[PDB]
Structure formats: C-alpha cells, structure tokens
Amino acid sequence: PRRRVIGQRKILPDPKFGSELLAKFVNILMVDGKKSTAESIVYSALETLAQRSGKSELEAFEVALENVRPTVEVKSRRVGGSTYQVPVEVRPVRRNALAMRWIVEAARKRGDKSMALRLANELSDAAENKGTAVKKREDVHRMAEANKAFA
Amino acid sequence: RKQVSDGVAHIHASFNNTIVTITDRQGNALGWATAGGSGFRGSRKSTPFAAQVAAERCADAVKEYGIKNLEVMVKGPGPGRESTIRALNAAGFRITNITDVTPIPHNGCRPPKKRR
Amino acid sequence: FCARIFGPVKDYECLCGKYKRLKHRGVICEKCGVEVTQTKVRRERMGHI
Amino acid sequence: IKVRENEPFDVALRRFKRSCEKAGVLAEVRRREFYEKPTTERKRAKASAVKRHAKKLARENARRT
RNA sequence: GUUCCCGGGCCUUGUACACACCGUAACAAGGUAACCGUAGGGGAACCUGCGGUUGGAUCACCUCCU
RNA sequence: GCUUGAGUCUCGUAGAGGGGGGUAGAAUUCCAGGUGUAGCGGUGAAAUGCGUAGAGAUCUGGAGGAAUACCGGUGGCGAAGGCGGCCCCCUGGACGAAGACUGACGCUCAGGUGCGAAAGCGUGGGGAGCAAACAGGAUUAGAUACCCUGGUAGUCCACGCCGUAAACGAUGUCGACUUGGAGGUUGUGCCCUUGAGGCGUGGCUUCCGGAGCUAACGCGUUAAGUCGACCGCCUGGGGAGUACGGCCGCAAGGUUAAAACUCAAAUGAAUUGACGGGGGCCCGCACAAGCGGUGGAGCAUGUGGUUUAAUUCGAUGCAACGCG
C-alpha cells in the first residue's frame, strides 16, 4: 500500500518435483489450511490427468497450463474524464498464479467424486481447451479487444 | 448523379452541432449529414466522435455520386475539425485539401447574445 | 569538459550559469564546484581518474 | 488555412489553421461584445505574466537548494 | 499503483462570518461576479439593454512540435 | 531696464482627435431559380414554433442596415467624455535641433459659460442581429426569473431639451525639487547609421524599490514625498443625497440643498480557525486482485416492545447488543 514495490518471497517447494509453481499449485488447493492433506491429492490428480492427457506429469501439465494462463486483465485505471477500463499486460509473477487459481476453483465445480479425480478432470480438460476452467479464461480474453485503443 | 470528383465538403462544427455536407464544385449540393440527425442529442452534439459518425453518414448514400478527391473546407471553429477529417480518410476518401474558410466577418455585425 | 572538475569557459565564469561578471573570483557553484577563474587557467587544469 | 501536401500523407495536419487564428476571430464574435470587459481581464493577465518575468529575475540570484 | 473511495494531516486561496455556513439579492467564483449612473416595468428583492471601474476569482488539467 | 517664467516665428513628426461626405469587401435576414433530405433550433433536460403549401443547408444574382477580424501592443490622441477599415476637405492639441525677441505679458478663482458616455421624448427616414412591456413551453410549491421561439420602445443619422454618473490609475490645477533597471511609443544631435548600435535631451504610461508619509495595503520622478497659490468639501450614521420653494423643462426630473425622532454604532485594512461538490502531496487492507463470515439454518446471550404480582437500574449510531 503506497510503498510496496517489492514482489514475492521464497516459498517452500514441493518435496517431490522440482517446481515451486507446483508448490504454488498446492498452496491454492490446500483447503482449510491442511497442506499435507490436499498435497497427496495433487499427486493422485497430476498422475491421472497426465495419463488422460497422454504425456508426462511435467509436459502434460505445461500444455495444460498454456491454455489457462491469462494474457491481460482490464483494470479500473481511468486517465480521462470518461469511465472506461484499461487493458493491463499482466506481470509474469501473476500469470501462473491466476491459471492455477481458476483450475482449483474449477475443481470445486463439477461435483463428481473425490477432488483428486475432479482436478484430474479440469486440467486434462484444460489440455484440450474444453471445460469450465479454460472457459473462464476465454471470457476474459473476449473482454480485452473492445478496450485496446487508448495509448 | 451529375458526376463529380471534387466534392466541396463544408464541415461546420459550431458549438453544439456539427454539419457535414459535400457539394459540387459548381454548387449543386450532393448529400448531407448532421450530429443531430444521426442521433446524439445533447452534450454529444458537441463531441468530435459524433462528428466522426457525421462523417460516416456523409460517407454512405453519397457514393451514388462518387467523390474521391474532396475539398474539405471547414467552417466554424468548433469541437471536431480533425476527428471528422480522419473519419473521412478512414472512410475511403482522399482529401485533396483541407481549407479553413470559416464564416469570418471583419467584426461586421455584432455577435449574438447568448451564454451565461 | 566538466565544470565541477575544470570550469570557466568565459573569463571568470560559473558554467552552471550563475556567476558571469568578472567580479567573481574563486566563488564556486556549490552544487558542482566551478571556481570562477581564468579559462587560461583551464589550460592548466589537471584531473584524475 | 489551405493545406494539401500532395498525396503521400494519410493525415490532416491542420497545424496552420491554429497558426492562423482558429479561435482567434471566435473569441470576439461568439458571445456578446461587452465592449470594456476583455480590457479588464487583460490587465489582470499582464500583471501575472510580467510577474512571471519578475519570477525569472528572482531565481537567478540564489535558489540555493 | 494513488487517478476511484472513507477518514486524518501540511501548504495555499476566498469571506460584510466569528453570535464562527413572500424570495436566497450581496459576502466562497454565493454555483447568474460586484458597484455607480440613465429609462421602463414588476407583489417585492431587483431584472434587461448601454457606458465605465476594480472596493473581483482560477489562471489548476486533457491532447500536439525541439 | 536686464533674464533662468509664459509665449510667438523659421524647419519637421506620429495618430481609434472632432465635423460633413463618398466607397470597397465578408457575414446575418428575406425574395426568386437549380439540387436534395427528413429533420432544424436549443438546453442540465424538455418544449412552443418551422416543416410534405418541400424548411434547415449550398451556389449564383439583387435590395436595406449596423459595425470594422487578422494588424492589437497596463499601445495612441485628448481638458475630459469618448473614440479602432481607407481617403478627400477644414483643422486642433502635444513635442524636438539650432537662433532671433517683448522683457513676469504667470497661476487659480463663488455667481457664469462651453464640452458632456448612455438613456428618455418631440420630428423626418428606418429595422438584418439583439432586446424592456407581453404571449407560450418548463426547472418549481408559484413565475410576471435563468433558457428558447417571436416581438414594440430603443440600438443608427441630423436638429434641441433633461445637463445626469464608479464623468474613479477614486489621486483637482500651474510651477520648482528629489540614488536606478526592464519596457513600450514618438523625434533629433554626435561617432566608422560600416550591420539588427553606444552616449545625452523632452512628452505619456506600467512594474519592482530608495529618501518620505501612513492605520495597513502600498504610491514612489506620471507620487499618497517637500512647498507656495486658488476653489470646493466634512464635523457620527440613518432620515436623505429625498420632499417642498427659486430657476429650467411638453415629458422623465435635475441643481442649490433641511428637520423631528432614533441608536451607541457606522467604515477600512490585515490575520488564526470553521467550510468547500477548489488544487497538490503523504499514510492505513479505503480500493484494485483473493480467502473466510453475519444475513438463508440450529444453539447460547442481550436490548426495544409485550405481559405480569414482579419480570431492578444503567448503556441505548460509530464508542448498546458473549457489556456491567
């Protein structure tokens, strides 16, 4: 607030795979503060989604990430006297954070079975641009073009 | 009709109304367009975007004549005067010359009584 | 061609543009030390790096 | 007033209209005469413009910051 | 990130206020600047036109050239 | 009698200075004709009205009337008011280089006279634009007010009356005296005006200041500073710069210019706060981006209210309601 220029800090990674983004992926899925509980579920989801996708738990996670990753986000930063929105190029520190954010919000959607299978669905579906997680991302994409002109 | 290439387009953005009208080199009027007939009744009559739509109304229903090089002679120092010009350049026209032959008296008659 | 290091281009001159008159002798530009002196003495200005 | 720039332009550039008068003739013939009024705001304006010159004369002597 | 919003604070600007913000006519720019003179009118303050004055306010932003 | 006072002549200069008249050009209104659309005007918004009896708009041609963009400059002339296109006729005021002269012929002044913005009225022409009275649509509790569509006096020219003002850089007029800079504006003398300059001499005017004065602000060679001279004005405000009488006036009024009674103030400059839908900046999860709640459900506690024999009282926007 009014001084913070600082970015993020160091987060304890996942004690299995060498990715802190997957660690960030656990931070958002861990409900009610129970990390270990939701963590072992990331495992039973990442494996099964990667198999329904067709590849490994690293590339089937990447091609399933490129589709749910934001581009822009229009924000209320009016310059003129009119009330409009301004498409904002989203920072790199924020892109994966919002991709993996909507996937878990989509993991609460589709109320089929255990969350390990629900997640296994939404990211495997994300790998093919079908589903409610990617659908969300597509809607924001549609909102960008109608505002991009004020330079 | 009448076959004209050089269309004298008098654009008169007064204060709260902008009229665009292409006429003949001789004087035979071709077609008009106004910020008041295209809609935008209000403080919008004093906006250059309304003048941009005024140029668009003076872009269609005038191709029956078919003007290319037009003498956009602007009158009255008002709101538009550039948004209207580039509306015409993005309409498919080529303005050969933008002239400023605004209604200018040598402080002839007195100005009108309004505004307060 | 620094003014703080070297200085005077005009006879008794503060390069920043504050002291012009030849009344100025030695008084520097406190911001970037320009001792108002002879541009002839600027043929004797040795520096360092 | 009358700008042409042959044909490679794709731009208006009415910069001479403004270098002519534009609002010049308008300032006197848009709202009623009032005769003496403009004169009044001419004095106030000059007082603040000449003081701007006195301002340029006040900054030259120190402004030690 | 401070432009949006709620509260606090510093500097500045203005007041015929400090008893301290039937019609609002003046005093903040009173949100229609004030005042004098001339003619006419209207329940009433005053209003409209014309000439003059400072016993008046801001000259802060949004777009274009080295 | 003599000159540093006033003033005149010889030789020149710039200008919205005044009176009378002529002329050029654009735009607004209207009329006729060619073209063409379904809208024009205006306001915070709306509307009367105009329009299919083809308006608004454009071009060509034409008849009136008022006023002079750009040049424009706290620039210029003038006693002041006041006044911007050009020119012709008459002509005024101000100023300068170098000399010749009468020899203080100088200044102000009650009664008086002349000029006297604008406006009103009588009379002869006149009307594009705007606009008192008035009609209409509304914001509104109402509109004879803001705004708009029409429109008469008037605005313009000439002859008179009223002879009025913030006719106020609020600074009465003539003369003399008093360190400078930036300018603006109009002439001349001297030097290589060789070139957009330098050093002096006068008028008008603006800003910053010294000597000085004052309550302060500030004026400051054009003074609110220092003197001489002349006229007018004030003795608290309101009543009242008005009634009536003299004089003038067709009319509207004006000039000279009071009292009873009443209150214990009236006025001016300068400041700290209160307030701002005035401006800038800084801080806090205020907001932007998210997670979890009350409210929808159950339990526990408390208040208003109700009831009762009694259901103490207190607190009762924030700062009462898991508080005593």
Tab-separated table of C-alpha atoms in Angstrom, chain B:
chain	number	residue	atom	x	y	z
B	1	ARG	CA	-25.563	11.553	-60.284
B	2	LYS	CA	-24.245	14.665	-62.059
B	3	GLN	CA	-20.789	13.049	-61.911
B	4	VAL	CA	-18.454	14.957	-59.589
B	5	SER	CA	-14.990	14.085	-58.270
B	6	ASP	CA	-14.050	17.239	-56.364
B	7	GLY	CA	-16.598	17.433	-53.563
B	8	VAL	CA	-16.514	20.634	-51.525
B	9	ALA	CA	-17.275	19.221	-48.075
B	10	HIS	CA	-18.193	22.119	-45.785
B	11	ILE	CA	-17.941	20.895	-42.201
B	12	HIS	CA	-19.431	23.438	-39.803
B	13	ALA	CA	-18.826	22.487	-36.172
B	14	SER	CA	-20.347	25.490	-34.389
B	15	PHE	CA	-20.679	24.902	-30.648
B	16	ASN	CA	-23.218	22.111	-30.126
B	17	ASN	CA	-23.947	20.837	-33.649
B	18	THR	CA	-21.631	19.753	-36.459
B	19	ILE	CA	-22.912	19.663	-40.039
B	20	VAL	CA	-21.055	17.900	-42.851
B	21	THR	CA	-22.088	18.484	-46.456
B	22	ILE	CA	-20.393	17.671	-49.749
B	23	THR	CA	-21.480	19.875	-52.638
B	24	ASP	CA	-20.493	20.286	-56.276
B	25	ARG	CA	-17.554	22.365	-57.488
B	26	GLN	CA	-20.232	24.487	-59.144
B	27	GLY	CA	-22.588	24.407	-56.174
B	28	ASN	CA	-25.055	21.561	-56.711
B	29	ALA	CA	-25.481	20.035	-53.245
B	30	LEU	CA	-24.903	16.273	-53.120
B	31	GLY	CA	-25.665	14.901	-49.667
B	32	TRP	CA	-25.625	16.000	-46.031
B	33	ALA	CA	-25.049	14.537	-42.558
B	34	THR	CA	-25.587	16.049	-39.103
B	35	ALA	CA	-24.721	15.348	-35.472
B	36	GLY	CA	-28.395	15.976	-34.774
B	37	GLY	CA	-29.915	13.591	-37.295
B	38	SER	CA	-27.583	10.682	-36.652
B	39	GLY	CA	-28.805	10.851	-33.052
B	40	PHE	CA	-26.538	12.052	-30.215
B	41	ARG	CA	-28.809	14.847	-28.989
B	42	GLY	CA	-27.198	16.615	-26.047
B	43	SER	CA	-23.642	17.439	-24.974
B	44	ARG	CA	-22.930	14.707	-27.519
B	45	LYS	CA	-23.824	17.212	-30.237
B	46	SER	CA	-20.634	18.945	-29.111
B	47	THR	CA	-18.425	15.858	-29.429
B	48	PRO	CA	-15.968	15.003	-32.258
B	49	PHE	CA	-16.963	11.328	-32.126
B	50	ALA	CA	-20.453	12.427	-33.135
B	51	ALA	CA	-18.640	14.365	-35.844
B	52	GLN	CA	-16.911	11.095	-36.705
B	53	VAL	CA	-20.325	9.489	-37.208
B	54	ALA	CA	-21.387	12.628	-39.048
B	55	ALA	CA	-18.548	11.952	-41.474
B	56	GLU	CA	-19.753	8.353	-41.747
B	57	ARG	CA	-23.287	9.500	-42.573
B	58	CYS	CA	-21.619	11.690	-45.190
B	59	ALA	CA	-19.665	8.617	-46.296
B	60	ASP	CA	-22.633	6.484	-47.363
B	61	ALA	CA	-25.618	7.407	-49.544
B	62	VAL	CA	-23.174	9.729	-51.321
B	63	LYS	CA	-21.262	7.062	-53.220
B	64	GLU	CA	-24.118	7.308	-55.709
B	65	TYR	CA	-22.312	10.437	-56.866
B	66	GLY	CA	-18.839	9.092	-56.184
B	67	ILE	CA	-16.319	11.646	-54.919
B	68	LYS	CA	-12.640	10.843	-54.310
B	69	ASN	CA	-10.504	13.968	-54.025
B	70	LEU	CA	-12.646	16.210	-51.838
B	71	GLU	CA	-12.127	19.812	-50.762
B	72	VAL	CA	-12.927	19.524	-47.066
B	73	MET	CA	-13.400	23.224	-46.393
B	74	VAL	CA	-14.028	23.527	-42.668
B	75	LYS	CA	-16.165	26.338	-41.286
B	76	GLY	CA	-16.784	27.443	-37.712
B	77	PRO	CA	-14.142	26.777	-35.007
B	78	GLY	CA	-15.902	24.034	-33.062
B	79	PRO	CA	-15.406	20.615	-31.358
B	80	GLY	CA	-14.453	18.364	-34.290
B	81	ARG	CA	-12.216	19.660	-37.094
B	82	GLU	CA	-9.820	16.674	-37.127
B	83	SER	CA	-11.754	13.678	-35.845
B	84	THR	CA	-14.135	14.384	-38.719
B	85	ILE	CA	-11.227	14.746	-41.155
B	86	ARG	CA	-9.628	11.425	-40.195
B	87	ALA	CA	-13.056	9.812	-40.214
B	88	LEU	CA	-13.231	10.676	-43.908
B	89	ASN	CA	-9.683	9.421	-44.501
B	90	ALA	CA	-10.681	6.147	-42.857
B	91	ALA	CA	-13.890	6.109	-44.881
B	92	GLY	CA	-12.220	5.547	-48.240
B	93	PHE	CA	-11.628	9.143	-49.314
B	94	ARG	CA	-8.547	11.158	-50.209
B	95	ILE	CA	-8.850	14.758	-49.074
B	96	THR	CA	-7.005	16.770	-51.713
B	97	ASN	CA	-7.071	19.847	-49.497
B	98	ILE	CA	-8.397	20.817	-46.083
B	99	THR	CA	-9.293	24.507	-46.276
B	100	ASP	CA	-10.277	26.797	-43.407
B	101	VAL	CA	-12.843	29.124	-44.968
B	102	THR	CA	-14.764	29.620	-41.725
B	103	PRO	CA	-17.595	32.203	-41.643
B	104	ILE	CA	-15.408	35.241	-40.927
B	105	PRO	CA	-16.764	38.771	-40.568
B	106	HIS	CA	-14.435	41.775	-40.239
B	107	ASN	CA	-16.264	42.251	-36.957
B	108	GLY	CA	-19.102	43.245	-39.236
B	109	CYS	CA	-22.405	42.806	-37.427
B	110	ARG	CA	-22.463	42.356	-33.643
B	111	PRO	CA	-22.059	38.826	-32.276
B	112	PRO	CA	-25.194	37.101	-30.863
B	113	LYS	CA	-26.499	37.371	-27.279
B	114	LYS	CA	-26.234	34.003	-25.512
B	115	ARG	CA	-24.324	32.054	-22.845
B	116	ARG	CA	-24.121	32.893	-19.124
